[PDB]
């Protein structure tokens, strides 16, 4: 199926507490592969997935030097933005940046991204087709004019459409054993007496990869939403994901309800029903 | 692999 590579950067000012904090994480699909934290002792970009450790010293030296340059630019931006907004010298603020690319099933470029946020709100971002900028306010307009004089959009697209897609493919191949693995969900259904006239049915989907999945309830063959609860997809902690959907039903009528599970790892969607 | 050059806001 589709694939993506993405880098997430977070910088937080810490008034009277040293340099701001800088954290960088890298992901391929739903798998983190690299890390950098300005407070850790190593001061190295570090591996977080097995396949990336096959890269040599030049790679790690280069990625470390690039992520450090990145931390230095964000440390400056924190001061610039405070200036644009005429803000607190001793107040804590946050700058986030995300960039990367999406490729289809055949591994060909689909789209790219480069977005920036200040204090959890959109600041400036490249539009969907990468050919122009979206600037939130007068401050972002100041950034936008500087970025257009330096031809930043063009610099990024060269990376987002070429280099980014080239490394995503390199990683997917080297880490094929885990990155191109499809782990169908292990499923089951639980049953609890809620009260004198009700019973709860909980449909589970466990140990699945990638995270994209669909859990739904039907009653008498028709979609059911009344008295239902669907939790956010969550990480198991071992590289896999979990998710569940529940429904409250009248006691004695639980077999009229069915749970449908759709995931890329299943050659055919599964249908669960309460079997006492 | 990370982007190498980043322009300040």
């Amino acid at each position, epitope marked *: 199926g589709s694939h993506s590579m993405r880098y997430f950067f977070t910088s937080v000012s810490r008034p009277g507490r040293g340099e701001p904090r800088f954290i960088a994480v890298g992901y391929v699909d739903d798998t983190q592969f690299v890390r950098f934290d300005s407070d850790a002792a190593s001061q190295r970009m570090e591996p977080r997935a097995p396949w990336i450790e096959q890269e040599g010293p030049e790679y790690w030296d280069g990625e470390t030097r690039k992520v*450090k340059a990145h931390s230095q630019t964000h440390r400056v931006d924190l001061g610039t933005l405070r200036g644009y907004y005429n803000q607190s010298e001793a107040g804590s603020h946050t700058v986030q940046r995300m960039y990367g690319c999406d490729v289809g099933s055949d591994w060909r470029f689909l789209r790219g991204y480069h977005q920036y946020a200040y204090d959890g709100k959109d600041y400036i971002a490249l539009k969907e087709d990468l050919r122009s900028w979206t600037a939130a306010d007068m401050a972002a307009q100041t950034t936008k004019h500087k970025w257009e004089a330096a031809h930043v959009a063009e610099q990024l697209r060269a990376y987002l459409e070429g280099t980014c897609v080239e490394w995503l493919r390199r990683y997917l191949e080297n880490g094929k054993e885990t990155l191109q693995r499809t782990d169908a969900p292990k499923t089951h259904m639980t049953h609890h007496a809620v009260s004198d006239h009700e019973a709860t049915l909980r449909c589970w989907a466990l140990s699945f990869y990638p995270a994209e999945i669909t859990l739904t309830w039907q009653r008498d063959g028709e979609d059911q939403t009344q008295d239902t609860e669907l939790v956010e997809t969550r990480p198991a902690g071992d590289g896999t994901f979990q998710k569940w959907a529940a429904v409250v039903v009248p006691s004695g009528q639980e077999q009229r309800y069915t749970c449908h599970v759709q995931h890329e790892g299943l050659p055919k969607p599964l249908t669960l029903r309460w079997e006492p | 692999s990370l982007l*190498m050059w980043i322009t300040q806001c």
Partner: T-cell receptor
Amino acid sequence: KQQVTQIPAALSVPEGENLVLNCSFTDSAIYNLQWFRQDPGKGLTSLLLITPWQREQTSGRLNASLDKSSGSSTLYIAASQPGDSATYLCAVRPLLDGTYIPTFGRGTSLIVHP
Amino acid sequence: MGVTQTPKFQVLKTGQSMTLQCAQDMNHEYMSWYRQDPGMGLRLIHYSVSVGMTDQGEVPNGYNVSRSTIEDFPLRLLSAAPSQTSVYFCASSYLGNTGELFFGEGSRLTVLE
């Protein structure tokens, strides 16, 4: 690895002549190309700055372009003057290597006779 | 404004230590030091892409640098030797924008026995 070559190495001409100095590089993946001037016993003065997205720049009688064949740049000096005499250095910066280190050529020593 | 190197000239005795200073007020992430002997080319000593980060160039032997603030990048000659007689240049830039390099005026050191 990047190698910057500048031809001609030395250039001696009468004033008023239009000059063409060349700066070629082996690794076309560059972030920028910068031309400088250096006179004997003095520092370096930046003259022009070009990039793959802003391929030409002009400063008076000087203009440099980042040629179509992605491995060369030309510096043009119109109506040369004895004041133009100096060593012209060209340097490029990397777009992908993760080091950011510039690579300089050996320079072109120019003498413009009055 | 721009890049300021100090001192511009200096005479050292063999074995003395010396620190050359270099400051910039442009918020440049990148700072570097070069040496260039008379009529020869520029040789990179050390450079820095960020505070707390330094790396070696072509000739780091006999020199030390530190980057504790974004503005300053001092070059320390540990123990002066006659072979360190040269012209030293500090150069800085943004690691973005145009990447344009900005050179200081130069520092001329002569080491004598």
